[PDB]
Design a protein around this ligand. Sequence first.
Ligand code: CLA
Ligand code: CLA
Ligand SMILES: CC1=C(C#C/C(C)=C/C=C/C(C)=C/C=C/C=C(C)/C=C/C=C(C)/C=C/[C@@]23O[C@]2(C)C[C@@H](O)CC3(C)C)C(C)(C)C[C@H](O)C1
Ligand SMILES: CC1=C(/C=C/C(C)=C/C=C/C(C)=C\C=C\C=C(C)\C=C\C=C(C)\C=C\C2=C(C)CCCC2(C)C)C(C)(C)CCC1
Ligand SMILES: CC1=C(C/C=C(\C)CCC[C@H](C)CCC[C@H](C)CCCC(C)C)C(=O)c2ccccc2C1=O
Lengths: 79, 261, 86, 130, 665, 169
Amino acid sequence: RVPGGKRTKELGLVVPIPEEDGLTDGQIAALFVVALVVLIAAVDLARSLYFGLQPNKFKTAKGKGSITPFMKRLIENGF
Amino acid sequence: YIASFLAIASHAHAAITLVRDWVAPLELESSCTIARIHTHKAAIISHLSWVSLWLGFHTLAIYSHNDTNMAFGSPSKQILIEPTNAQLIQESSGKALYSFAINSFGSFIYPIGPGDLYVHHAIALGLHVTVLILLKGALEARGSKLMPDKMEHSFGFSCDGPGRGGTCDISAWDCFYLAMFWMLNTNAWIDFYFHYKYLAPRQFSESSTYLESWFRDYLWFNSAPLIRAYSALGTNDLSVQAWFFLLTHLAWATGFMFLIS
Amino acid sequence: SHAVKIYDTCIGCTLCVRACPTDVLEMVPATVNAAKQVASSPRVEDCVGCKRCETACPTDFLSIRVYLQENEETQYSLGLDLADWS
Amino acid sequence: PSDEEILAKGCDIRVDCTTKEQQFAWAKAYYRKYNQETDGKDPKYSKPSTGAGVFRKFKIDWPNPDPSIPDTTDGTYPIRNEDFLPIWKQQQEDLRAKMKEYIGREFTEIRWIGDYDNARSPYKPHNGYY
Amino acid sequence: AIFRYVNATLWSKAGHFNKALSKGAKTTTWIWNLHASAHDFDIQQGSAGLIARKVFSSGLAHLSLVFFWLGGMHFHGAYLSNYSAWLKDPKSVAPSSHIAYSLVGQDILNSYTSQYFSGITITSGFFQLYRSEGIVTQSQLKYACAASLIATLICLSGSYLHMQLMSKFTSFYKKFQSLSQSHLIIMFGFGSVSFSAHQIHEALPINSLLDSGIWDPQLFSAILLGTPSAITGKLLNPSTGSIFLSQVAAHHLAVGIVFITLGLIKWCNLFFSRNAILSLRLAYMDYHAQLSINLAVWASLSMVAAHHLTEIPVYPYESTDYPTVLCLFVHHACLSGFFTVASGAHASIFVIRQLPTSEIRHRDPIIGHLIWVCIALGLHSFGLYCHNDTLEALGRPEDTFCDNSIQLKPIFAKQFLGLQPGIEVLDGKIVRMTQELGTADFMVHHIHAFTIHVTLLILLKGVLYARNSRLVSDKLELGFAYPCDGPGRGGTCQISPWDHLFLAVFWMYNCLSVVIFHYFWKMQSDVWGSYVHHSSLTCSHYSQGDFSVNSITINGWLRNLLWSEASQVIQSYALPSICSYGFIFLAAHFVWAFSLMFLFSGRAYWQELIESILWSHHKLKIVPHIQPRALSISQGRAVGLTHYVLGGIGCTWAFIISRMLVLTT
Amino acid sequence: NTPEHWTIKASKRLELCKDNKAYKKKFKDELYKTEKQQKKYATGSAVYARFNKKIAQIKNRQEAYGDRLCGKQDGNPRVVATGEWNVRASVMWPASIFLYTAGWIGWAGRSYLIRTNDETKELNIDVPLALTCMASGFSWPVAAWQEIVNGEMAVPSSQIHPGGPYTQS
Ligand code: CLA
Ligand code: CLA
Ligand SMILES: CC1=C(C#C/C(C)=C/C=C/C(C)=C/C=C/C=C(C)/C=C/C=C(C)/C=C/[C@@]23O[C@]2(C)C[C@@H](O)CC3(C)C)C(C)(C)C[C@H](O)C1
Ligand SMILES: CC1=C(/C=C/C(C)=C/C=C/C(C)=C\C=C\C=C(C)\C=C\C=C(C)\C=C\C2=C(C)CCCC2(C)C)C(C)(C)CCC1
Ligand SMILES: CC1=C(C/C=C(\C)CCC[C@H](C)CCC[C@H](C)CCCC(C)C)C(=O)c2ccccc2C1=O
């Protein structure tokens, strides 16, 4: 390095550099696989946020909707 | 900086709450804290303005007195008010800590001098003026003597026209815009204080009583390595810092355009 | 487009109508005041938002209010000349 | 000892290099080994071009060059119109002698605040008119 | 003629001139409007005859003011100056006709100028002007002061008289042919001939004696005696470093003869292309048209003066008086910029009040092409600097625009003086030296062109779109100085010619600051300095010739010019000479920052704050019946602009003057 | 740890200036600079006499300030703001006199405004009445306390504009 700091030059502070890179190609690939999973989930989340709630679902969607018993208890308790 | 941003954010969102959330009672009714505050918002703002004016007048005047006397070469003529209250609090804290030790704390206690007193009063001025602007925006967001019907309009609107004498920067968002400059100033003052006392404790203690010390011993003196980073002689590891120093200067100057024209 | 509203405090002096740059306003018969007329805003689609009516209003606080709506800007309210949205 | 063996041994606070002096000795050895005083930029970019007397080197104004700029690239500027200075000195000395003879007496320094009678005044001199 | 109608009764009315101020003092806006419209004689009560009366009498009163200022300058030179010491030895003693009191330790401001004198070093070149004029005695300076005071009294009397001598029938001010002929033949031609006579008869003998070294009263109380056949300007006075005063006198005689000849050919109607200018003659017979044209003429002449006073040396020792030449250049450049923006303003006023010329009917192409040229100029010129910065930071000097790297040679910048090789020196200083142009000069000159073109763009847009535009079609009805037309149509802020000037002033200030920095750095690096020994000299310049190497980058400008050369002003507190300059540096920074308050904020916030404050006054029964009001929008803009320009100019003033004073002493 | 230490005199960060090495050095340096500046001019010069006067001023200033407290590190005289009246460089005396003068100015002014109650008088000052009020403002402390007590100073907030409307009417 060509240090430009007065304190660095005075005290001889150094930026030690390893001989070998910390992570290997396989480790970087695994991290990238996890990042890809994150990206897919994030795209799905962005789509959901963009489209918001769909109150029409009760007209065509399968099932009859459900409220968890704890959610019902919270509703009964109130705010 | 993050703390200052969050504080001004809390103020801005309180103003927005008043604009579009608070359900004000009828005028004569005074039952909630917000209504009680709105009853004497004028007194609040006038007293805050008085405090800000006092702090600014006296801090700037003492600094200018010291500046002129130092320029004429007579440090003995400087007004140097010893920080007796802060020193007493610090001595009590040190007494408690010493008792605990008898039963190290570094940087929790610092020498504290008249320069510290002046800088603390400057920072108090900054805080008081920022709060003045934000409180005025919040308490005039719903209505004002100049614009009584400000509830109907959005949180941020351009103006109300050149009539009624002119209505630039009449919205609560415009008060936030204005208080943002102050936040940046008061935060710059705080950061300059910390950085100067950190770099040169002794020089800060002896010379921080007049503004030329801040302008010369802190900015001009310590600006050398950054500007010298890259030149015709060569470059060093601070060249990136020197290019971002100038890029940001240019960004500031560009902001001047949208602010003025 | 902007929203130009008129309130009964109106005294029918016609200054808003005379100050209108794009003829958004017109006086209409009324019994609320002594002048027996109140300004109306039928052509609010042409309102540009200059608030000259508001400048010319005499009443203590304005009997005519122009609320700006930047989201609903139209070519008439923007005074577009070189480009046409019609 | 020496930088080579210092770096071969290495530094580790956790195990042996519990001495700040040893730590900074190793740091200085590493600095000397791996750091350079300057980036090594060509010295030419630092040398001046205009006003240093070396303008002709760059050939900036080759087509119809300006005569007033010296052609020499050594970096030295000759004095323009050197030949006139002796002539000017001779002219001014000759004029000094001519006026001295014309007056007939030695020149007397004028007084900034002094008052002098006009040579043609009809009244008796109070202060010498010269 | 009837002087019984001039009474002091109207002195206490304070607003009689403006009918809009009849309802006196209902608010503070009334005070501000009174001041703003005090001198707007066109919109004031009366008639066109009264407007002409006021214009002419005010011109005469200002003439008297200038004469008073000149008389004060002469008096200070005579009694409160070291002009005697400077005349005997100009080099050793710095000019100083300025002394400060010892009130609060303020005596520290006075600095050593001579053995028996201590004061403030002046930078106006008045000592050199006196020396050129031949003024070498306190009696002569005293009589010059007396003449200036008598002229002041005469001009004051003339203004007072003409306020009543001129009646509604008066028309002498509309006789443009007579006015121009008289000014061209008498004021200029005869004036120049008479001044050539003055030089030949008074200054030439005195200046020749001073150059020789003679200081004899009898001598102080044969043209071309010492001037050789060398072309004027090609040979400077070896003992003074300036053009021969006999050559100057011959110049003035020739100029007067030329002016008289021009006037006589105009009198005889020899000029034939009257039709090409007849349209302008008919259109521009207006107060504001003439004011704009004259302001532009004097701005250009001031810029030419700024350049020539330095490049071409004519005053004795002003060439080596580095603070003097620098201050003269900077002052006259600033005046050029201010009067140019003034010309733009009054062009806009003329367009508003009168019918414009037909070039306004294709204004869209004009301003469109000016916008394009401004954008292209700025892009290329400033992006060369940005490219240099980025590449040099990345570590690739070979990729930058500089003399060693890619070079932009100014091929068109060619000599015309044809001077001999070498430089001219006088007592350890470089009186004259050729400026060598390269990539840095190319870049800085194109920056100059860019800034000039943008300022011109703002002024021309204000002038051409004053009457109406696509946005607002009744700008003529709105007038000249209005804040806006409303938040409508997107927002019509600063659509008025007044606001166009308000921005053109910022841009003129930016242009002039860059010009001042260019001149200062180039002169310090490549022209001024000392020399160390057919003889060849190595020239040691004050800035060490760093302009050509460092000026190619904005970082170089920031470091080698502002930071590096602010050492004198920034470290001036202890020094008796320039402690005032350091304090003014600080205070100008403060004022410039304080201007941003008005430049960024708006009326409504301050009005609401004022009302909240006034609540407490009303509570305590302090009721001001001149109801406090926030400054109008246009006034806030004006205050911000004034403080901004004043602070910037003060910082530059203190910085450059401190540097020059310290370096030369 | 003692009531005696409450006084600013008994503090470890301050010392008497006459016994402060930094204070002595600073003044010695100021005197040296002034003398060096003086030496440039001729002995019998008016500027020489002025510099002698300035040197005398500096010496008298040093003698006067020797009694005041100043920090050990920098040795510059300090201003006591605790509230101790009987201490050199006390802030109370200037504070009290300024407060009296400022109250005088405010009272005078308020009294003129109350007496006139007219924008015309505000613009064209009734100089006799203005001078009368300026002279009368000397008893402002007693007059102001009496008016505050008797209710002639402040008016109920219902008599003045409160501000903008924050609710529906
Ligand atoms: C009481 C203050 C005072 C007074 C009365 C004068 C008076 C004079 N000075 Mg000035 N001067 C002052 C302070 C003062 N000066 C200070 C503090 C300095 C710094 C050491 C100087 C340095 C100085 C020099 C070097 C020269 C003068 C000269 C003059 C004469 C010029 C005429 C004139 O002013 O025209 C009116 C001119 C103006 C109103 C100029 C307005 C615009 C200026 C140039 C803007 C520049 C920045 C500004 C100074 C500061 C802005 C920031 C600030 C608000 C904090 C006159 C005798 C000249 C002379 O010939 O003297 C015999 C001369 O050469 N003065
Ligand atoms: C540094 C501050 C700054 C900057 C950058 C500008 C820039 C500009 N102003 Mg100015 N202006 C300023 C301050 C500034 N102003 C202030 C404070 C004011 C208030 C008084 C004004 C008031 C004002 C007015 C009233 C006008 C201008 C005009 C202009 C334009 C001039 C022409 C042009 O664009 O050419 C040069 C452009 C530049 C130098 C911009 C930077 C270009 C760089 C070097 C190259 C870009 C490289 C690359 C493509 C970037 C990609 C980034 C991306 C990948 C992220 C330009 C946009 C005029 C205009 O618009 O005319 C057409 C105009 O009328 N300005
Ligand atoms: C289809 C069908 C049938 C079938 C079938 C049959 C027999 C199918 C068999 C399928 C088979 C045998 C499929 C293997 C997949 C292996 C995978 C995906 C491995 C990935 C491994 C990965 C992604 C690992 C990656 C890394 O971690 C590694 C290793 C190193 C780290 O540094 C990091 C990385 C990221 C680099 C029936 C049942 C017969 C009838 C039915 O009717 C229809
Ligand atoms: C002692 C001391 C201290 C402390 C102090 C304090 C803490 C104080 C307080 C104070 C306060 C806490 C006060 C209160 C107040 C209140 C009120 C409520 C008031 C009111 C007022 C009024 C009402 C007025 C009126 C008037 C007058 C009287 C005059 C002028 C005019 C007028 C009208 C303005 C210190 C440390 C600082 C310093 C040292 C000493
Ligand atoms: C601060 C400010 C105000 C408020 C400022 C006001 C009302 C100015 C105050 C005027 C005073 C009373 C004039 C007296 C002069 C000064 C008090 C002098 C001080 C001098 C020192 C050296 C002591 C506006 O009204 C305004 C309007 C439009 C755009 C920007 C602004 C703006 O920035």
